[PDB]
């Protein structure tokens, strides 16, 4: 396969379905990417992640640069070899989790300095260092290093962050291109900023397209603005991005958010919702999510979801999983997580099929009627 090739096979309104071909594999879009925090998709072997239908997973750069270390992972053969996943891996820049999880973050035009929330050590992440770390990890899809804008944001602060992000996008692009091996085997995605302001989103889109990237992410959303506002921003933002390149909505995962985002032109998603769901006891079903810990499931012999085809729903009952979760058993987490990721992959498959068959709008309507 080529380094990168996105082809749209079908459309319906703003929705698209197709494939991204990369050296390590083919990614069917719209795609949902399970999140692998510390070089592991929580409670699942890579083979199980693949069995659910996942074509690609996401790796958290922040955690990886801290815990095992980027250089160490490189010496060990790369992230793919290290964790046992041989298909594409998209890695975030690490900047977002720096502003969220680390201590004493000192920001500047050069980048960000911070203290680890683990050992209390210090690191200086920048557009160049972030790109380098993702290269050391052996990432297939590299995210440009940006500055995420907090919600709510004033027009002037949103403009300043967006402008810095665009300067950092150019630096990321140049850093990526100067590294022959990375430029030839991996892809680079740019990230649109601008908060909820249309003029800023437009300026960001133009700057990103001017530089040129393999894909474009809509950043700055799912930060506390609510679904209505998120959808409203997507309404005018997605059309600004190049039509022939993938559109990635970062950190968006509720089933209904995904359906609405695809209706607005989004091709890629990622979220910790599926994995963290089977941590507090939340299991997704076509009739809405359920909390398996509730007493009403103690003697329920039915599977998590009545039509889900995952191994968990074929072999175990709600009653058993209810017991496991309440007992704090590891198998409870393993089973809940496998089901949830499988449910998400089945959702993406139903979305892809409906678009290909020109009945996506009907699918969205039916999905919502039953889910709510």
Ligand X SMILES: CCCSCc1cc(N)cc2c(=O)[nH]c(N)nc12
Q: Which amino acids are annotated as binding site, given as ranges?
A: 92-96, 146, 193, 220, 308, 310, 313, 339
Which member of 214, 267, 270, 305 is catalytic? 270
Beta bridge partners of 124: 113
How many Cβ atoms are within 10 Å of 147's Cβ, its own excluded? Answer: 22
In terms of C-beta density within 10 A (0-12 exposed, 13-18 middle, 19 or more buried), how is residue 202 classed?
middle
Which member of 55, 92, 214, 305 is catalytic? 92
- Given Zn ion, ligand X, a second copy, none, residue 339, with its beta carbon under 5 to 8 Å by kind, binds Zn ion
Beta bridge partners of 27: 20
**Residue 300 known to be catalytic:** no
Cα-to-chain-centroid distance, residue 247: 12
**Residue 305 known to be catalytic:** no
Of 24, 42, 123, 247, the residue at the interface with a second copy (CB under 8 A) is 42
Radius of gyration of the chain (CA): 20
Q: 350: part of which helix (H) or strand (E)?
A: helix 330-356
- Given ligand X, a second copy, Zn ion, none, residue 82, with its beta carbon under 5 to 8 Å by kind, binds a second copy
Q: Do residues 39 and 57 make contact, with C-beta atoms less than 8 angstroms apart?
A: no
For a second copy, the closer of residues 45 and 164 by Cβ is 45
Of 39, 125, 148, 230, the residue at the interface with ligand X (CB under 6 A) is 148
Of 276, 286, 331, 366, the residue at the interface with a second copy (CB under 8 A) is 331
- Given ligand X, a second copy, Zn ion, none, residue 148, with its beta carbon under 5 to 8 Å by kind, binds ligand X
**Does the protein bind a second copy through residue 295 (CB under 8 A)?**
no
For ligand X, the closer of residues 65 and 304 by Cβ is 65
Tokens in use for 212?
């040129």
Question: What is the Cα–Cα distance from 70 to 79, expressed in whole angstroms?
Answer: 9
**Does the protein bind a second copy through residue 71 (CB under 8 A)?**
no
50-58, 201-209, 309-317, 363-371 -> range binding a second copy (CB under 8 A): 309-317
* Nearest position to ligand X, beta carbon: 251
Q: 280: part of which helix (H) or strand (E)?
A: helix 273-280
Q: Which residues contact 13 (CB under 8 A, 6 or more apart)?
A: 263, 360, 361
Half-sphere exposure of 30 (CA within 13 A, CB side): 39
In terms of C-beta density within 10 A (0-12 exposed, 13-18 middle, 19 or more buried), how is residue 361 classed?
middle
Residues annotated in the binding site for substrate, as ranges? 92-96, 146, 193, 220
Can you give the binding site for Zn ion, defined by CB under 5 A? 304, 308, 310, 312-313, 339
For a second copy, the closer of residues 243 and 299 by Cβ is 299
**Which positions from 263 through 282 interact with ligand X, judged by CB under 6 A?**
270, 272
**Does the protein bind ligand X through residue 95 (CB under 6 A)?**
yes
Of 258, 324, 342, 364, the residue at the interface with a second copy (CB under 8 A) is 324
- Given Zn ion, a second copy, ligand X, none, residue 99, with its beta carbon under 5 to 8 Å by kind, binds none
Provide, rounded to whole angstroms, the least separation between the CB of residue 174 and a second copy: 32
Residues annotated in the binding site for Zn(2+), as ranges? 308, 310, 313, 339
x-marked contacts with ligand X along 60-79 as a string, rule CB under 6 A? x-------------------
| DSSP strands (E only) in the chain | 5-12, 15-22, 25-29, 31-33, 35-36, 57-59, 89-91, 103-107, 112-115, 122-125, 141-143, 187-192, 215-218, 247-249, 268-270, 282-283, 290-291
Question: What is the Cα–Cα distance from 230 to 210, expressed in whole angstroms?
Answer: 25
Catalytic positions, please? Answer: 92, 270
Return residues touching ligand X (CB under 6 A).
Answer: 35, 58, 60, 92-93, 95-96, 146, 148, 191, 219-223, 250-251, 270, 272
């Amino acid at each position: 396969r080529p380094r990168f090739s996105f082809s749209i096979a079908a459309r319906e309104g703003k929705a698209r379905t197709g494939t991204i071909e990369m050296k390590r594999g083919v990614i069917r879009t719209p795609a949902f990417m399970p999140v692998g925090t510390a070089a592991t998709v929580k409670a699942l072997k890579p083979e199980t992640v693949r069995a659910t239908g996942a074509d690609i997973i996401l790796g958290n750069t922040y955690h990886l640069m801290l815990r095992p270390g980027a250089e160490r992972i490189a010496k060990l053969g790369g992230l793919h070899s290290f964790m046992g996943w041989d298909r594409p891996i998209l890695t975030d820049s690490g900047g977002y989790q720096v502003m969220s999880l680390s201590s004493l973050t000192k920001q500047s035009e050069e980048g960000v300095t911070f203290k680890s929330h683990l050992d209390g050590s210090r690191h200086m992440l920048s557009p160049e260092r972030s790109i380098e770390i993702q290269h050391l990890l052996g990432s297939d899809i590299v995210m440009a290093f940006d500055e995420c804008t907090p919600y709510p944001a004033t027009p002037s602060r949103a403009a300043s962050s967006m402008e810095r992000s665009m300067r950092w996008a150019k630096r990321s692009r140049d850093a990526f291109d100067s590294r022959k091996e990375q430029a030839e085997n991996a892809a680079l995605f740019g990230i649109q900023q601008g908060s909820v302001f249309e003029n800023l989103r437009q300026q960001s889109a133009d700057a990103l397209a001017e530089i040129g990237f393999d894909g474009y992410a809509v950043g700055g959303l799912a930060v506390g603005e609510g679904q209505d506002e998120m959808f409203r921003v997507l309404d005018f933002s997605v059309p600004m991005l190049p039509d022939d390149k993938p559109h990635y909505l970062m950190g968006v995962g509720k089933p209904d958010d995904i359906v609405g985002a695809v209706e607005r032109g989004i091709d890629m998603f990622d979220c910790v919702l599926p994995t963290r769901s089977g941590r507090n006891g939340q299991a997704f079903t076509w009739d809405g999510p359920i909390n398996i810990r509730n007493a009403r499931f103690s003697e329920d012999l039915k599977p998590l979801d009545s039509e889900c085809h995952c191994a968990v729903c074929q072999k175990w009952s709600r009653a058993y999983i209810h017991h496991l979760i309440r007992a704090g058993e590891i198998l409870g987490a393993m089973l809940m997580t496998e089901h949830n990721i499988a449910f998400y992959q089945q959702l993406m498959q139903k979305i892809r099929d409906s678009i290909s068959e020109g009945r996506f709008s009907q699918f969205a309507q039916d999905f919502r009627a039953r889910y709510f």
